[PDB]
Amino acid sequence: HMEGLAGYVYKAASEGKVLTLAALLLNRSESDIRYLLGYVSQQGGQRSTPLIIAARNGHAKVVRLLLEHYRVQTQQTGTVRFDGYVIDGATALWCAAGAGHFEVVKLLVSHGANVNHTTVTNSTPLRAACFDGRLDIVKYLVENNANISIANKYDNTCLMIAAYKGHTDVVRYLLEQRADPNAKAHCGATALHFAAEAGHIDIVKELIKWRAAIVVNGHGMTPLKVAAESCKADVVELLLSHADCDRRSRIEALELLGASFANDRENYDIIKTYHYLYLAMLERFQDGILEKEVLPPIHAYGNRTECRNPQELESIRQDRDALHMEGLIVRERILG
Amino acid sequence: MEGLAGYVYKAASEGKVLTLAALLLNRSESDIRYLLGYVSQQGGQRSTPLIIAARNGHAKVVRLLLEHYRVQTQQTGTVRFDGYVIDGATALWCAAGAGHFEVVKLLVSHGANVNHTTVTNSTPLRAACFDGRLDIVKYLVENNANISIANKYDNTCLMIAAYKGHTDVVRYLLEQRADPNAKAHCGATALHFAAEAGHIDIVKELIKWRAAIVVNGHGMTPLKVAAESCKADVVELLLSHADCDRRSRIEALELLGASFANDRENYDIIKTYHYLYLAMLERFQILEKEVLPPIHAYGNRTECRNPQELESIRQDRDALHMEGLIVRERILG
Ligand SMILES: O=C(O)c1cccc(N2CCCC2=O)c1
Structure with missing residues (x-):
């Protein structure tokens, strides 16, 4: 009937042919224009709407035509795929951040977008851009009223995923914006534990000099002990040159x-x-x-x-x- | 003192056979049994001139030390290989370890014990399997080195080669009846070693030769060890056989x-x-x-x-x- 037309508008959006998208949507009723811009077409393990796919693939021109000339809610959720990792409940903002589509982030946010959107796992756009590694986006987001405090369903601060992936610059940035490094997770680990096992000595540097506490995880292990089990000698050496429990625990490492x-x-x-x-x-x-x-x-x-x-x-x-x-x-x- | 045994040593270690033949000529019979039987200690190692020479592939020195100066092959010593310090190693062991097939032939052709036992029971064949030079392994076997001799913890020559991933010599060993159902102190068989590593071509041969699925001391089958080590190739190759209907399969x-x-x-x-x-x-x-x-x-x-x-x-x-x-x-x- 008309469902096929929505598949055609998906193509133009996903592929980025703004010329095609216009020819499909113009001379149509506003009622129909919403059905076309808001039908969940599923392709390649990705259930999305024209806007969401045009922002995950990064077609700024199509994004504008869908936002500056057409009225999208900038809040349509979609099940998107990222390198096997599948994320449900993400908006165009989240997908854009995860893909580092800074231009879309400008377009989306400045054209209205909950910078603190919550996926089904509470992943805010800030987490996606940290998990990615683009500092440029992160600052723009928080400087546009994003919250570095909002975590995930398992309490993983944006700092924690930044430490894991080893993005030193953004780790320092969130710490500059007072992102508390002593937040814990459901496992019991703090951002220190993560950067330790991953041998991210650069991040472990910027952590200690920011009130980074020596917490213990659910596995009865300090950040040092994790780094030991993870063959990251450099960290163990540095962590030993600190407030390490002498003897008993120092030798154990x-x-x-x-x-x-x-x-x-x-x-x-x-x-x-x-x-x-x-x-x-x-x-x-x-001695003894x-x-x-x-x-x-x-x-x-x-x-x-x-x-x-x-x-x-x-x-x-x-x-x-x-x-x-x-x-x-x-x-x-x-x-x- | 006799730091002259020190100069004689440097010649053998460096292969400078001309310097060596010079030092040793015009020596009384008592003087040559001292100089060559002397144990120098050079860089985390202890050896005689013949030990360091065969260790270093200096066959020009080995041949001089053998043909013209009747020297005992059995001279043991403490040699070193990438941090691993082996004690009780004869020159033949050192040649088989360092892959010096020329020096191996010289030592064997001149009657060296092809079945010497290192202080920890390493046979000269084990050193060659560790090293993978099939040329030596084949040569040692044809001159009666025993494949059955395993070390102080029953590490077969087949195992150490299955561990080090020498498919070409693994094949050869089982071709020479080398038992694939060996078992070490830690309960491992040659299959467990090849399954831990991603050594599909070795694991292939072991199941060509009807290797038994045993459980090592740690309660592990070669299937489980492979799955424990993320060796999915070995897991699927191994699962193309017999495992506890569903239970073991699912577990892996x-x-x-x-x-x-x-x-x-x-x-x-x-x-x-x-x-x-x-x-x-x-x-x-x-x-x-x-x-x-x-x-x-x-x-x-x-x-x-x-x-x-x-x-x-x-x-x-x-x-x-x-x-x-x-x-x-x-x-x-
Ligand atoms: O046989 C053994 O127990 C043994 C132990 C340590 C090292 C070695 N080898 C010999 C060849 C190269 C090498 O590392 C053998």
């Missing part, structure tokens, strides 16, 4: 960091394991003396027991197999 | 998809859902699942127990990563 340099088969080093392990054993016995309760010998680790004194560690130096078995026997005790 | 599929979100080196949440939904589709074809309690670490979320539940989180980046650890925390521990 080195005992963990080295162990991680074995359990990998992709970043393994083994020599970096003996180094980080023997170093700890020395400190655990530096902080001993270790070794778990009983198990089969998976060759009915072998963890070295408990510095001399034993020096004996397995000439034993490739034992240095491997050690890294995992140490890990089992530290992590569970 | 569940664990494989969960590891894709975990593995920060191969992150693919699209692949995670694909393998996780396929399990719930192969479950509810009934094999229900015993979900573990909601834990703070995982946002006090509970594992999806029905296909509809999984379908609900597909447009939810966060819950997909969270589900991953939740699935591993159950399947592995």
Whole structure:
């Protein structure tokens, strides 16, 4: 009937042929013009409206024709796809931000757009632009009354996703706008925990100098311990040069960091394991003396027991197999 | 003192056979049994002249040290390979390790023990499998090196080659009856090593040669180890055989998809859902699942127990990563 025409207006919008879009919509009743601009055509795992697809693909001319000459609500939600990650309940603003379509962000926001739109997971345009990495958009959004405080259904601040993806500049920016770095998440992790495991030493720098607290996650691990389990030596080194619980927890990191340099088969080093392990054993016995309760010998680790004194560690130096078995026997005790 | 044994050493290490033949000529018989039997300590290593020469492929020195100066092959020493410090290594072991097939032939042709045991029981054949030079491995076997000799923890020559990914020598070993159902102290077989790595061509040979599916000391099949290590190729190749009707199949599929979100080196949440939904589709074809309690670490979320539940989180980046650890925390521990 007329449904086919709406598929034709979708094409012109999605593809960006403003010339075609005009020829389709002109000489039509306002009632019909709304049905055409507001029919959820589904293509390529993406349920969207002409405006939403024209803003996710980034066809500013079509966006203007749909906003400056035609009246769109700038609030039509759609199920959009981003690199496999599928997002539902997103408006053209969110899709534009995620795609870094700054020109559309100007057009959309300045032509009216809830800068604090909430997807079904509460993802505000700010989160999408942070998860992307375009600082240029982020500032314009917040400087146009966006809220850096609004999180997601699991309480993930825009800072947290910025730390994860490793966008140092935008991390500093949100911190400049007083984005509290001590907000927690459902897991229990803070933005520090994220940038730590991801080896984002640049972001860990701008975090500590901004009241970044040493919180503990739901896995009983400080940001340091996460970085240790994640073979990010640089962070562990820097985090040690701070308010690190001396001994008990300081040695545990080195005992963990080295162990991680074995359990990998992709970043393994083994020599970096003996180094980080023997170093700890020395400190655990530096003066006195902080001993270790070794778990009983198990089969998976060759009915072998963890070295408990510095001399034993020096004996397995000439034993490739034992240095491997050690890294995992140490890990089992530290992590569970 | 006799730092002259130090100059004699530098010649052998550097292969300067002319300097060496000069130092050693006009030496009394007692003087040559001292100079060559001397154990110099050079850079995290301890060796005799013959040990460092065969270690370094200086066959001009090895031939002089062998043909004209009757030297014992059995001279053991403490050699080093990329941080790994091996003790009790004879010159033959050092040649097979460093891939010096010329020096290997010289040492063997002159009667060196082709079955020497390192202080930790490394056979000269193990060094060659570690190194992958099929030329040496084939040569050592034809001169009666025993394939059965494994190290202090029963690491077959077939295993270390299956681990290091030398398909060409793995084939050769099993061609020489090398047992594919070996088993180490850690309970692993040669199949577990090849499955952890992405070594499909080796895993192919092992199941060509009817490798047995065993459970290592850690409660893992080669299928589970592969899925635990995000080696989906090996998982699907292995699943083209016999596994516990649904139960083991689903387990690997569940664990494989969960590891894709975990593995920060191969992150693919699209692949995670694909393998996780396929399990719930192969479950509810009934094999229900015993979900573990909601834990703070995982946002006090509970594992999806029905296909509809999984379908609900597909447009939810966060819950997909969270589900991953939740699935591993159950399947592995
Ligand atoms: O046989 C072993 O236990 C063993 C242990 C450590 C290193 C090595 N090798 C020999 C060849 C190259 C290399 O790293 C062998």
